[PDB]
């Protein structure tokens, strides 16, 4: 599954968060990295992220946890079904298709609010036929 080089690449990534060097990642260290990228998270944001990766539940992340999260096969691990149902929330009544203009409205103005350039990439790659109607079932597979 994992190469020896991907594990080493994940070890270097783990070192960039683990500024103290003690082998664990705290919520405060994650907040320092995120602020260095221009993000401005809150304490609940950071704790939400840590709780999803912390296995034991101590509130900290060790490298085994970090590697477990980074190596999760987020393609077959029942993820395609949830992204499908996410698209179905806005589905064109059963259709299985979504208007390219409607997808742009939801992606740009709701949730995380993607950029207009990001939506261009998403629409262009997902509009296989170039008609303005994307079938998300096929788009989900491309992502996974």
């Amino acid at each position: 599954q994992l190469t020896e080089e991907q594990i080493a690449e994940f070890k270097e990534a783990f070192s960039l968060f683990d500024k103290d060097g003690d082998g664990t990642i705290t919520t405060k260290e994650l907040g320092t990295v995120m602020r260095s990228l221009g993000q401005n998270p809150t304490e609940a944001e950071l704790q939400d992220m840590i709780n999803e990766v912390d296995a034991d539940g101590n509130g900290t992340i060790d490298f085994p946890e970090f590697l477990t999260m980074m190596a999760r096969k987020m393609k077959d691990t029942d993820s395609e079904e949830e992204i499908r149902e996410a698209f179905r929330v806005f589905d064109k009544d059963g259709n299985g298709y979504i208007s390219a203009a409607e997808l742009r409205h939801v992606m740009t103005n709701l949730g995380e609010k993607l950029t207009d350039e990001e939506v261009d990439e998403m629409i262009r790659e997902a509009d296989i036929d170039g008609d303005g109607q994307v079938n998300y079932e096929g788009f989900v597979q491309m992502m996974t």
Binding site: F17, L30, L110
Partner: protein, 65 residues
Amino acid sequence: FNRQIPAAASLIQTAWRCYAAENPDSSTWKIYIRISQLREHHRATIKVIRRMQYFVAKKKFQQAR
């Protein structure tokens, strides 16, 4: 009225941002306006955070169901 709408969009958005970041010339790398020159150590931490935010958006969508 329907909390699923935000959580659904956020799950799609985070999943795609996670997928798009595997392409290093994607437009998704342009959103960090505060970074002068995007180096490789930025990209390494960005991919970790995006994976973390995908798992959070997945949980909140799950909870809103």
